[PDB]
Symmetry: C3
Subunit: 251 residues, 3 copies
């Protein structure tokens, strides 16, 4: 449940690299990891020498989503997800995701939150929420303004699995790259040429609409996420996945 911070003295550039390092649960979104990510962004922003952040990961999974009354707990998990995403969106620093592995559930919210997102040949993406009786409610806050409408409907509904070239095609990421590290380094160079003020303002232009969306919908989507989480359809839906069988609405 750890996030590694590496600043300009370590990166050798005007860049902070925050690396998700929780391989035991495949980088799941534990509260500890969340708080450490928050602290990472705080430290990054606090350093006048940093002009960009890279959100990297270890292991073959970028982020698999959350880990585990029930409703209160669920609605707070949703809220913390939202708060984190918002933290990324609100930052004066452009944030670049370096992805080379699987992304599921909340992982999507993280990717959507980053201003730039690059993904490599090992990556995979699947919105199987509906398959377990729920919906990608909270992650919609950063998914819906970046995905083409057709794509969002399609993958939300089909729950099918897709690669990096597809994710680029649909707006989920900025670009598919065979060498993620190289691509991200190039991007870091270019962005790094921007002035702190210029970059903050340029980003804020692009995030104003997103933040408007948070303001209007975040609490609503948290409460729905919880209602769904506690429902019986989701119970059966999760049991079926654990028991490795098919859920009772499908055979």
């Amino acid at each position: 449940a750890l996030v590694d911070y590496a600043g300009p003295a370590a990166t050798g550039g005007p860049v902070a690299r925050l690396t998700l390092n929780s391989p035991h649960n495949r980088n799941a979104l534990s509260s500890a990891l969340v708080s450490q990510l928050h602290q990472g962004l705080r430290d990054a922003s606090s350093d006048p020498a940093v002009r960009v952040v890279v959100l990297a990961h270890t292991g073959g999974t970028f982020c698999a989503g959350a880990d585990l009354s029930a409703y209160d707990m669920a609605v707070e998990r949703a809220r913390e997800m939202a708060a984190l995403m918002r933290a990324i969106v609100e930052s004066r620093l452009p944030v670049i995701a370096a992805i080379d592995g699987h992304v599921r559930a909340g992982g999507f919210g993280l990717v959507g939150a980053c201003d730039i997102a690059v993904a490599g040949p090992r990556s995979s993406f699947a919105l199987t929420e509906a398959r377990i009786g729920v919906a990608p409610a909270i992650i919609s806050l950063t998914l819906l303004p970046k995905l083409s409408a057709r794509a969002a409907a399609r993958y939300y509904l089909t729950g099918e699995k897709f690669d990096a070239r597809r994710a680029e095609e649909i707006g989920l990421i900025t670009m598919a790259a065979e060498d993620v590290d190289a691509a991200v380094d190039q991007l870091v160079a270019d962005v790094g040429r921007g002035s702190p003020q210029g970059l903050a303002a340029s980003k804020a232009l692009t995030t104003a609409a997103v933040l408007e969306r948070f303001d209007r919908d975040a609490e609503r989507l948290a409460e729905e996420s919880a209602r769904l989480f506690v429902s019986d359809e989701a119970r059966e839906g999760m049991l079926a996945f654990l028991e490795k069988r098919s859920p009772n609405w499908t055979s």
Copy 2:
């Protein structure tokens, strides 16, 4: 002026297929057909065994649009168009268009309304509204949030004709397929794996913005659609098409 309903016992899956079957006017949007489509969606939703709907058609035309004071009539046609589209958008069921033939005018509103839309090698699309002195007013309710801005402006203005690969490119449909039936069956399988609640909620996430658009603009767009319909430019515009000549603003 008929729509065929085929339920799970007939489809052999958790799917209802509503097939537009009005070849005499090439599947035009008569009031009867409209009411029957409404009833089809009502029956589909009413069946707990149905988790998805396919909107299919017979003949080489998916939908050619409407068939035929004048203003009152026009504004009610517009309103009925809107109501139908809204019925599709509001449904708890994901709706998939299976298209393999021509789409014109209101047909566009139907395609735009579906959550997923697949189109085959026989398909064609043209927004010739401006050519006859009118505009695609009411269909904008589902076209504008799904088409890329450049595409919408372009084809709205040029009235040029395009194919399925292009329609996929611009957001008008989800995917171009050589074998529409196969593609749609695959999609039906995948979506069908979703839970009723999960699918309804996942869809509602994607349609909230659309429905907001209906709330704000539907009546406005109906009244404009009627004003345009009754205007003299549209009269001349329609006469010219009937008389098979060029309209008086073009040679």
Copy 3:
């Protein structure tokens, strides 16, 4: 600081061609040029025989942006930019950009404002605003509703330079063409087949959202554009470009 007007008697079609003809400052947005562009659109609209406008240019640069208390001046430049873009968006006439050369800064606002934009093999595009301590504030009014979200974030932040095929890919222009004149002539033919009323209304459908954006943000973005312009980071940022060195936040 001149714009050439050529009407239907000259064009030989239902088209007015406004050609940016200010090669001494590579078609920069001087107030004179701005007023003449305004007058060009006014004359175009005034001519019942005109159904479309082409915004063309001479020289290898389409538009390089603006030319040159300080704050008052900056905020008025921003406001005039906005007013011009709005003039284009509000017009009853579809406006087509014919681009074959460089586009920078405000040039982007012009391209974004046109309903249709075609660009040739000589074209280049770069948002280096952040590089000089500023942001593409005012041009966001027409850029943000037409660019894919990922693209806008990327190029706003990286300031990297891109070509016509890329600009087409991201929504900045409608289409990349090897022969711009031919492409634009074809488009002009097709649009020209539209009725004046039909075209005005069809366009207004597509611009309603844009104009809403102007209403909400234009003044805000002007004031921010000025605050940025007068800041010290932008001073250093501009000096560095003039002195041909690297700015003090980059080496």
